[PDB]
Design a protein around this motif. Sequence first.
Motif, mmCIF file in Angstrom:
data_model
loop_
_atom_site.group_PDB
_atom_site.id
_atom_site.type_symbol
_atom_site.label_atom_id
_atom_site.label_comp_id
_atom_site.label_asym_id
_atom_site.label_seq_id
_atom_site.Cartn_x
_atom_site.Cartn_y
_atom_site.Cartn_z
ATOM 1 N N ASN A 108 0.661 -1.396 -0.005
ATOM 2 C CA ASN A 108 0.084 0.469 0.138
ATOM 3 C C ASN A 108 0.393 1.190 -0.034
ATOM 4 O O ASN A 108 0.544 1.914 0.391
ATOM 5 C CB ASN A 108 -1.422 -0.222 1.199
ATOM 6 N N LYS A 109 2.086 1.237 -0.277
ATOM 7 C CA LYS A 109 3.140 1.921 -0.369
ATOM 8 C C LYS A 109 3.945 1.973 -1.537
ATOM 9 O O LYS A 109 3.515 1.354 -2.937
ATOM 10 C CB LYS A 109 4.195 2.183 0.372
ATOM 11 N N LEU A 110 4.901 3.319 -2.168
ATOM 12 C CA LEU A 110 5.023 3.325 -3.070
ATOM 13 C C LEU A 110 6.845 3.186 -2.689
ATOM 14 O O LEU A 110 7.846 3.926 -1.664
ATOM 15 C CB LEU A 110 5.033 4.517 -3.891
ATOM 16 N N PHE A 146 7.106 5.611 0.710
ATOM 17 C CA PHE A 146 6.469 6.913 0.260
ATOM 18 C C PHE A 146 4.703 6.536 -0.283
ATOM 19 O O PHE A 146 4.148 4.960 -0.555
ATOM 20 C CB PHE A 146 6.925 7.559 -1.184
ATOM 21 N N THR A 147 3.414 7.909 0.003
ATOM 22 C CA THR A 147 2.541 7.659 -0.475
ATOM 23 C C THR A 147 2.332 9.288 -1.121
ATOM 24 O O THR A 147 4.082 9.791 -1.270
ATOM 25 C CB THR A 147 1.609 8.056 0.358
ATOM 26 N N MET A 148 1.848 8.777 -2.251
ATOM 27 C CA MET A 148 1.129 9.971 -2.910
ATOM 28 C C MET A 148 0.134 10.542 -3.409
ATOM 29 O O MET A 148 -0.987 9.571 -3.130
ATOM 30 C CB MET A 148 2.078 9.173 -5.448
HETATM 31 C C1 LIG Z 1 -2.863 7.333 -0.588
HETATM 32 N N1 LIG Z 1 -1.851 7.849 -1.021
HETATM 33 N N2 LIG Z 1 -0.191 6.323 -2.077
HETATM 34 C C2 LIG Z 1 -1.284 5.349 -1.809
HETATM 35 C C3 LIG Z 1 -0.834 4.373 -2.283
HETATM 36 N N3 LIG Z 1 -0.836 3.366 -2.454
HETATM 37 C C4 LIG Z 1 -0.562 1.885 -3.318
HETATM 38 C C5 LIG Z 1 0.744 2.750 -3.572
HETATM 39 S S1 LIG Z 1 0.685 4.206 -3.424
HETATM 40 N N4 LIG Z 1 -2.397 5.804 -1.456
#
Ligand SMILES: c1n[nH]c(-c2nccs2)n1
Length: 152
Positions: A108-110, A146-148
Amino acid sequence: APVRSLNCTLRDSQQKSLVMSGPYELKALHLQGQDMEQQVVFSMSFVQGEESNDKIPVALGLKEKNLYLSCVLKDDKPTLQLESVDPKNYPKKKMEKRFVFNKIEINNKLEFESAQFPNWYISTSQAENMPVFLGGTKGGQDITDFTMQFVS
Ligand SMILES: c1n[nH]c(-c2nccs2)n1
Ligand SMILES: c1n[nH]c(-c2nccs2)n1
């Protein structure tokens, strides 16, 4: 046709924002409220490169600046720099390899891996107001997740 790009911000998994640190470095710090405006806005370009469902090759330019994150050897180490380019020629679909990051979806991140230097990642420190850097270590003290946010 053209290259496709999205405006965005990044935050590390400790919710530190990224700001300028002089002209050719970023730093990460806890930001909220009025100081939010200080955070860097990226133009994330979707570029030529090896691609899978969860691994997307991108370039990270600073919005409406001819400046890109790049990975180069410096004093013999893989190193994150901000590099100036000819504004007539960028962004482009076929970005040079030093500019390319594999944007990887992980829990759930980058993560942003250097395409040039496998298993080197855009990293931040746990400490406040320290440089964003290219680190060779995941699962340690330094932050590689990270988040985006998608900006107008
Ligand atoms: C909210 N902001 N970034 C995210 C992400 N979810 C999957 C990869 S980055 N959720
Ligand atoms: C898959 N990869 N990145 C994403 C995002 N969701 C929110 C922000 S980025 N999903």
